[PDB]
Design brief:
homodimer; alpha/beta; Aldehyde Dehydrogenase, Chain A, domain 1; Aldehyde Dehydrogenase, Chain A, domain 2; globular; binds nicotinamide-adenine-dinucleotide; binds chloride ion; binds magnesium ion; oxidoreductase; alpha-beta structure; Structural Genomics; PSI-2; Protein Structure Initiative
């Protein structure tokens, strides 16, 4: 019954029933009716009504509320980790780190706001030049399922900080996490209408994206969906759109002295979250020859031993299920399809429990595949390409329309310096796993992975617009008038 | 002799349609050439592409030295450049000289903005070093306007080259001579072949360039109509960065103030400087109902009728010159006629005193009684007046527009300005200062239909480079504690 949160109260949905299912055992974890078009309009109108007072209040009051939210999350951390685990399959240790990221987002967002969208004042001739930044108004946040708390939070926190009001539409796959996140905001004192939650599937998302009352839409999800949204907004520059989309991220591994360290780094890059982070390594470039062979064989051996299991299983698993049976089925077909085109399974991905979305890591050598898809496979399926020399590695790493992350494992600083020069990505690491980018830095992909509105530290930039003012306490005549007067 | 396109370090004659620019008063040919056809546009994009890796590789300090030599070259040729701006746009020499000074000054401010907004930071994070760098996109097109034919394109070109992009510049077909001389200065400054390319032309050329798949970015200043078409064209192509600086319908609210003379002067500078062709010019003057407001307007009309309007090099110097073409003048006069037809009252009718010349005298029209007032930008010296009942009505009317570039308040009350800031919806919001002449040291971007949330001037840096976040360690290593399950 308490499905949507609009204008400061909960209400039942009137649209299609939505259920989220435990990815392993398939039990219903949450259900409710989606928001119909009417309820979506109510959510936008609620944000609209709340906006003037929220925008008008002192910044420090908005900061206090965001700080109370982080403190409330912290106090409910175990409960939220458990819900994230229940719904996404993520092991408890990993879900806990997601909650920690949500808590930490507040202080970092405050720092970024003062730096990127703060207030400055200075003399300019006879007058005073002031710079301020102001919120857009009502913004929709579309959440993904992979970090169902942290990634929407990475839009919601800086948006509310700047003085916008938000309508949050979570992934239909992770509604329970969103519900609990709203409960933390509510417990923290958030004013009615400042943040509104509309749950639902396609129809709800479509109605919100189409709503003319939005001043902005902040999105994390697939490049397919984000491109649709971008096309939809073509010719409407008045509405700010921030698109954080997927990638096809290469990890280049030169022969390095500490081979086990490299193998561990590859696993953390490719298979953490069962390969469901935006930044996971999708293609592993490994040089031809004996060392490369040893690297791969060790990777395959260690990856085969990785614990895959239930979120709350003990001993704790390294990774959990993919988000649904549908997603697992789709990945197994991608593996089958590639193998059909000549890919060699160095370690074949399997589904060890019938009717559960658990998948074991996959490592496929696609060196011999003629035409390789420039496609993002959102799961633990790592493609390997063997390369002849470093220039060919760089060429291959760049052979994608995407541009989120890239990385080099190499003992050579000179080699990394070249890699930086030739890379085409928002995140470029040296000897560190591709995953776990810190909120203290901007996070945005280029090419098909974004629309030049990087999030994380730079989220501030799309949450407020600059207002430049020249101010003087009275009109006055200049000492010398312009000619002709 | 003519100099038409500059591509890969060489001057080339055009293969497209003939293009002439005409002195807006005398109608004499100021510049003439053939536009760049599609194959020449492709050559220019390819030239930028070929030059990009080396230019982007270069140490920042070497790009800075070129930009500084360029500024110094503009300074040495300042008189020459002011007279060409005057010739082509009609703008008085005194005002043209200020445009050249803004061009020179853009370099040092862009370097400051680059280090602030798109610089490099490095520090420890866990057992690694977190480094932030910014990289250029690649090849960017710059579409120039006619109103500031040197300063506004320079405001995209300088920060774009500084960040390491290479550029294809398509100037307004109304101001090609200004762009030619600007390129001659870049060339004299030592610009490397292909780093900045110039394709002159009309719509044929602009359409070919905007469509070219080789662009990584397109930076535009011009009308909302044209910018919206570009935005539509790029829908579904988020990989190409678009920065759109469009026009506005800017309101200036005037409360009763003690210094009536200063108020009138400030309004004139806001509405009629550059013959009303700055994108920040006041388009709507909001004046309180009642005797004081009637007096303000009576004075404004009397003073506006005496403003000197004339040729760019006339002496005594005119306050303002012609609008950009006879066609533009025609369009503005028709707009005035249409509005009066619908009930607007001519407090001061705009006139075209010399047949065959695009000189227009200032217009002030009371549109209060006009039913459905167009939310339209009239790019010329035609000021619309709306009389309001109370301050809340003034704010409502100020905000009754799809645009959002500039807004201002003349008022002796700081409290009224504070409220005005709270309720304003514009990127430039001034108190007791003319709406025109914004600082390069601050961001310059309109909201609503006036931009796409990519402000230029100080924040141009933001769209000229993308951040690259790096975590770095001299070698791979194992954590003291492995993740579970391994
Ligand atoms: N660059 C980044 O920051 C980043 C970060 C994390 C994840 N991702 C990504 O997220 C992905 C998968 O997660 P996902 O499945 O939730 O992405 P998604 O595209 O499926 O969905 C994200 C969201 O947009 C919506 N949506 C779905 N269909 C819609 C439609 N037809 N019309 C309008 N809205 C619609 C949702 O319901 C929702 O809240 C990737 O492809 C991936 O790499 C990107
Ligand atoms: N926000 C800003 O900073 C700002 C500042 C000053 C002026 N302006 C503005 O500039 C305007 C007028 O100048 P303008 O006449 O050059 O505007 P414009 O749209 O006609 O021209 C600007 C440019 O884009 C091009 N172009 C024109 N038609 C095109 C087409 N059909 N397809 C592709 N490209 C095309 C040009 O040829 C050119 O270089 C305004 O409406 C105005 O307020 C904006
Ligand atoms: Cl080295
Ligand atoms: Cl991450
Ligand atoms: Mg309670």
């Amino acid at each position: 019954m308490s499905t949507h949160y609009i204008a400061g109260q909960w209400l039942a949905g009137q649209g299609e029933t939505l259920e989220s299912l435990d990815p392993v055992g398939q039990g219903v974890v949450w259900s409710g009716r989606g928001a119909d078009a009417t309820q979506v309009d109510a959510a936008v109108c609620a944000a609209r009504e709340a906006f003037p007072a929220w925008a008008r209040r002192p910044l420090e009051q908005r900061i206090e509320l965001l700080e109370r939210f982080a403190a409330t999350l912290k106090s409910r951390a175990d409960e939220l980790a458990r819900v994230i685990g229940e719904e996404t399959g993520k092991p408890l240790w990993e879900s806990a780190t997601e909650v920690t990221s949500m808590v930490n987002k507040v202080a970092i967002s405050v720092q970024a706001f003062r730096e990127r969208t703060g207030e400055k004042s200075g003399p300019l001739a006879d007058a005073t030049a002031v710079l301020r930044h102001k919120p857009h108004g009502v913004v929709a946040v579309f959440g993904p399922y992979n970090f169902p708390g942290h990634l929407p939070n990475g839009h919601i926190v800086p948006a509310l900080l700047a003085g916008n009001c938000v309508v949050f539409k979570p992934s239909e796959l992770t509604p329970k996490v969103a519900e609990l996140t709203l409960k933390a905001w509510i417990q923290a004192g958030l004013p009615a209408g400042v943040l509104n939650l509309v749950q639902g599937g396609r129809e709800t998302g479509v109605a919100l994206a189409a709503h003319r009352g939005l001043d902005g839409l902040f999105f994390t999800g697939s490049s397919r969906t984000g491109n649709l949204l971008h096309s939809q907004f073509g010719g409407q520059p008045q509405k700010i759109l921030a698109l954080e989309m997927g990638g096809n991220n290469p990890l280049v591994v030169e022969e390095v002295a500490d081979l086990d360290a490299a193998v561990y780094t590859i696993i953390q890059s490719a298979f953490i979250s069962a390969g469901q982070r935006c930044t996971c390594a999708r293609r592993l470039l490994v040089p031809q020859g004996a060392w490369g062979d040893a690297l791969l064989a060790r990777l395959v051996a260690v990856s085969a031993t990785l614990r895959v299991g239930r979120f709350d299983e003990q001993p704790a698993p390294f990774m959990g299920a993919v988000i649904s049976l549908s997603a697992a089925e789709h990945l197994l077909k991608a593996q089958e399809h590639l193998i059909g085109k000549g890919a060699q399974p160095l370690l074949a991905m399997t589904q060890p429990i019938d009717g559960a979305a658990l998948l074991t890591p996959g490592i496929l050598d696609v060196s011999a595949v003629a035409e390789r898809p420039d496609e993002e496979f959102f799961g633990p399926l790592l493609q390997v390409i063997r390369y002849s020399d470093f220039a060919a590695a760089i060429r291959e790493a760049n052979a994608t329309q995407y541009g989120l992350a890239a990385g080099l494992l190499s003992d050579s600083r000179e080699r990394f310096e070249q890699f930086l020069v030739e890379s085409r990505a928002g995140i470029v690491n040296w000897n560190k796993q591709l995953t776990g980018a810190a909120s203290s830095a901007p996070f945005g992909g280029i090419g098909a992975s974004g629309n030049h509105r990087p999030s994380a530290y730079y989220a501030a930039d799309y949450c407020a617009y600059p207002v430049a003012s020249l101010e003087s306490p009275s009109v006055s005549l200049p000492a010398t008038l312009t000619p002709g007067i």
